[PDB]
Amino acid sequence: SIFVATSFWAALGNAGDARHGTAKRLWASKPPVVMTSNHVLGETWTLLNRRCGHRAAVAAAAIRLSTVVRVEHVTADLEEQAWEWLVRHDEREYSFVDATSFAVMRKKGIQNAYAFDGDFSAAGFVEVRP
Amino acid sequence: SIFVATSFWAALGNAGDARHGTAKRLWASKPPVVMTSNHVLGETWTLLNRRCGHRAAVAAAAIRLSTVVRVEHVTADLEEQAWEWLVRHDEREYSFVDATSFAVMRKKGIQNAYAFDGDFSAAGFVEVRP
């Protein structure tokens, strides 16, 4: 299984992203179980909206309708763990969505992330490469 | 009676923000009932962590512990309402967090927002000023 982060969705959903081709390659080779979070989709919307405008962002909104991609609603319990995690890990700059993403992966026993730019790698997960 | 957006927290939590002065004055004259959301606090963490560093971002994390600020966990239902709203409103660039913020306010019957930049005003709310 894999967990998909915003950095990946943003690449996949933006044809003008420098890592678009890499993303599509990764997407074609993905395992059957693909999950992400409500926080990630929201972040993806915002990023794609700011970068490519409303139409491109609508694509991200539609992922929540997918029968193939599993979207975890991050619970209050999981968020509390993410907050605690965030407060202790001052060694590197981590976003809130990243911390909730790590928390989801730990909960679901997921080690592989579809993500770029090394934050998941730094946090002890595997950022899948083509 | 008021909902506090990310833009306000970011100004209040960063003394170098151009609207920090306005934020503190509004914060001094705020009503007894003050509300925000998990999404907003998460976004605030991320912004402050990038701009001012870990120690400053921890302040935002601590708001979730407040006995005076009500922190609403945005339900999957409210997010769905936010998603449908986002898809509908192409006339202006709206973030996901702001969309969920609008949804929370509408459900709670709140129109007065502690927020800057006019996005809440555009969405039909009152961005309160001193």
Swiss-Prot record, chains A, B:
Its cofactor is Mg(2+). InterPro entries: PIN-like_dom_sf, PIN_dom, VapC20-like, VapC_family. Signal peptide: none annotated. The keyword Repressor does not apply. It comes from the Bacteria. Mg(2+) binds at residues 5, 98. It is an enzyme of class 3 (hydrolase). Its EC number is 3.1.-.-. One of its GO terms (molecular function) is RNA endonuclease activity. Residues 2-130 form the PINc domain. Inhibited by EDTA. Coiled coil: none annotated. Pfam families: PIN. The keyword Nuclease applies. GO terms for biological process: rRNA catabolic process; symbiont-mediated perturbation of host process. Keywords: Endonuclease, Hydrolase, Magnesium, Metal-binding, Nuclease, Toxin-antitoxin system. Toxic component of a type II toxin-antitoxin (TA) system. An endoribonuclease that cleaves both E.coli and M.smegmatis 23S rRNA between G2661 and A2662 in the sarcin-ricin loop (SRL, E.coli 23S rRNA numbering). The SRL sequence is highly conserved and is implicated in GTP hydrolysis by EF-Tu and EF-G. Acts on purified ribosomes but not on isolated RNA in E.coli, nor on a shortened artificial substrate. Upon expression in E.coli inhibits cell growth, colony formation and translation. Belongs to the PINc/VapC protein family. HAMAP family: VapC_Nob1 (MF_00265). This is 23S rRNA-specific endonuclease VapC20. It comes from Mycobacterium tuberculosis (strain ATCC 25618 / H37Rv). The lineage of its organism: Bacteria, Bacillati, Actinomycetota, Actinomycetes, Mycobacteriales. The gene is vapC20.
